[PDB]
Amino acid sequence: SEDYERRRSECVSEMLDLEKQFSELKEKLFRERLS
Amino acid sequence: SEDYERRRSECVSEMLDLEKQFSELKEKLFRERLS
Amino acid sequence: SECVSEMLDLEKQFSELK
Amino acid sequence: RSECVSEMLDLEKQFSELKEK
Amino acid sequence: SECVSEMLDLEKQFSELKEKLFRERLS
Amino acid sequence: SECVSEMLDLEKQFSELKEKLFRERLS
Amino acid sequence: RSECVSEMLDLEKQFSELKEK
Amino acid sequence: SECVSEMLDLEKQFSELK
Ligand SMILES: [Cl-]
Ligand SMILES: [Cl-]
């Protein structure tokens, strides 16, 4: 058997994590460029 | 006299605030669309 | 500030939208 | 009636001003 | 109206700048 | 290499989806 | 040598898979 | 998970980039 939704969620959570790192960098660059 | 940099910073801070509201909505929509 | 009062208006409208 | 437009326009210009140079 | 199309115009400018900054800091 | 051009490709897909979602939830 | 490319490709496909339907 | 191990690699490379 395969816990398809558990596995899906672990993958989603990693993508969310990487995308929040990208976003944090974009927000830093935005604030630095305007300040 | 005009505290040009103080005034500039208050304007910048508001723009940062509005843009963080927009970002929070985009992040909510992203997570909901992937989950 | 004009920049600040207008942004506050915009922040309010974005809140109401949501 | 129509700050939406007027305000957007002004804030658009202020944003260009802030990210210049 | 709570300014929707104009709010979109502005958010678009912010997002375009963020994408350009990211690409530049990295490229 | 720490994968830079490929990291940009992916971030671009994420940002494009976020812009589409925002526009849709609001339009 | 080159997971960068291979990994990007796989994760690109996984991202399309996740946002489908 | 393949998705997870690859993402962790990508997260590490993004950290190293910074
Ligand atoms: Cl399992
Ligand atoms: Cl003053």
Side-chain angles (χ1 to χ4, degrees):
Chain A
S1 58
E2 177 178 341
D3 195 337
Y4 302 103
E5 270 313 304
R6 185 183 40 89
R7 296 164 59 157
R8 184 174 196 284
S9 296
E10 287 163 346
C11 177
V12 164
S13 305
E14 297 295 337
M15 299 233 169
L16 268 25
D17 283 348
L18 177 65
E19 195 280 334
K20 181 173 85 318
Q21 304 321 306
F22 290 162
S23 293
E24 277 166 26
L25 178 51
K26 297 222 262 177
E27 283 294 357
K28 189 161 112 79
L29 296 177
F30 187 76
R31 168 191 299 263
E32 292 164 353
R33 183 55 178 86
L34 296 189
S35 291
Chain B
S1 58
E2 177 178 341
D3 195 337
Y4 302 103
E5 270 313 304
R6 185 183 40 89
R7 296 164 59 157
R8 184 174 196 284
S9 296
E10 287 163 346
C11 177
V12 164
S13 305
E14 297 295 337
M15 299 233 169
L16 268 25
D17 283 348
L18 177 65
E19 195 280 334
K20 181 173 85 318
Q21 304 321 306
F22 290 162
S23 293
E24 277 166 26
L25 178 51
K26 297 222 262 177
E27 283 294 357
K28 189 161 112 79
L29 296 177
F30 187 76
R31 168 191 299 263
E32 292 164 353
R33 183 55 178 86
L34 296 189
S35 291
Chain C
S1 162
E2 199 178 63
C3 164
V4 314
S5 59
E6 292 180 322
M7 286 296 299
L8 289 163
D9 179 45
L10 211 49
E11 303 166 37
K12 177 168 192 151
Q13 301 309 309
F14 181 64
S15 280
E16 286 169 24
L17 212 28
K18 288 196 286 188
Chain D
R1 153 148 290 310
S2 67
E3 299 183 327
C4 268
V5 285
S6 283
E7 276 191 354
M8 170 201 102
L9 284 170
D10 188 62
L11 288 167
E12 288 298 354
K13 186 193 299 90
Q14 179 69 73
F15 178 62
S16 307
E17 280 163 350
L18 297 173
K19 62 164 220 266
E20 85 200 0
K21 293 177 181 179
Chain E
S1 174
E2 302 147 356
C3 297
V4 201
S5 50
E6 283 181 293
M7 216 142 227
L8 293 165
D9 271 333
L10 189 59
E11 191 285 320
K12 192 181 100 88
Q13 314 261 233
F14 292 168
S15 165
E16 272 173 18
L17 178 59
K18 290 186 150 174
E19 277 294 276
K20 175 172 279 196
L21 308 174
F22 189 80
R23 155 172 14 99
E24 282 162 13
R25 200 74 179 184
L26 262 95
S27 269
Chain F
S1 174
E2 302 147 356
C3 297
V4 201
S5 50
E6 283 181 293
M7 216 142 227
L8 293 165
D9 271 333
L10 189 59
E11 191 285 320
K12 192 181 100 88
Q13 314 261 233
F14 292 168
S15 165
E16 272 173 18
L17 178 59
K18 290 186 150 174
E19 277 294 276
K20 175 172 279 196
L21 308 174
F22 189 80
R23 155 172 14 99
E24 282 162 13
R25 200 74 179 184
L26 262 95
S27 269
Chain G
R1 153 148 290 310
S2 67
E3 299 183 327
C4 268
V5 285
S6 283
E7 276 191 354
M8 170 201 102
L9 284 170
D10 188 62
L11 288 167
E12 288 298 354
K13 186 193 299 90
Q14 179 69 73
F15 178 62
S16 307
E17 280 163 350
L18 297 173
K19 62 164 220 266
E20 85 200 0
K21 293 177 181 179
Chain H
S1 162
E2 199 178 63
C3 164
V4 314
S5 59
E6 292 180 322
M7 286 296 299
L8 289 163
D9 179 45
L10 211 49
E11 303 166 37
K12 177 168 192 151
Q13 301 309 309
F14 181 64
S15 280
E16 286 169 24
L17 212 28
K18 288 196 286 188

